[PDB]
Amino acid sequence: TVKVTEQLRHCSEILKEMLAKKHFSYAWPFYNPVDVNALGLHNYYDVVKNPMDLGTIKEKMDNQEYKDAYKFAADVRLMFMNCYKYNPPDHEVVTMARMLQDVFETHFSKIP
Numbered sequence: 001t002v003k004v005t006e007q008l009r010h011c012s013e014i015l016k017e018m019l020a021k022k023h024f025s026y027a028w029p030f031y032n033p034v035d036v037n038a039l040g041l042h043n044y045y046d047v048v049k050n051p052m053d054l055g056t057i058k059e060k061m062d063n064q065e066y067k068d069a070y071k072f073a074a075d076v077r078l079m080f081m082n083c084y085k086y087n088p089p090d091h092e093v094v095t096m097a098r099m100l101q102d103v104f105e106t107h108f109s110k111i112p
């Protein structure tokens with residue numbers, strides 16, 4: 001179907017919005033993969049088996065790798081889920097993830 005392509009172009013615009021700089025203050029921890037070495041996190045990969053970040057999603061989107069909007073949404077939500085599973089809920093990163101996720105969920109809910 002053609003409408004799948006229209007949905008994916010809406011998804012690409014949503015990805016560009018999540019990378020926009022109105023959100024920089026809370027989006028920056030999600031720009032790049034977690035660098036466990038820079039952060040001192042010897043236990044991250046024990047909890048998080050499938051790392052995800054917006055930069056990886058952008059390269060996947062630039063390569064036509066998402067065949068429907070629902071695969072894209074699953075990668076974005078995976079990124080958040082990794083953050084929420086690894087970190088305690090009172091952690092700043094979780095508030096920041098929720099602000100970015102609110103942006104995502106509001107925009108994704110409009111796709112037909």
Ligand SMILES: CCOc1cc(C(=O)N2CCC(N3CCN(C)CC3)CC2)ccc1Nc1ncc2c(n1)N(C1CCCC1)c1ccccc1C(=O)N2C
Nearest residue numbers: 028029030032033034035037038039041083086087092093
């Ligand atoms: C892209 C910006 O790099 C970061 C820098 C710093 C920082 O100030 N440094 C560390 C580097 C140190 N120098 C410089 C290099 N040299 C090697 C060593 C010395 C100097 C001091 C902190 C977090 C960063 N980036 C991040 N990326 C995902 C996550 C993430 N931080 N948070 C933090 C986000 C903001 C609050 C906490 C997490 C922290 C622990 C566990 C999980 C997560 C998590 O879930 N995510 C998604």
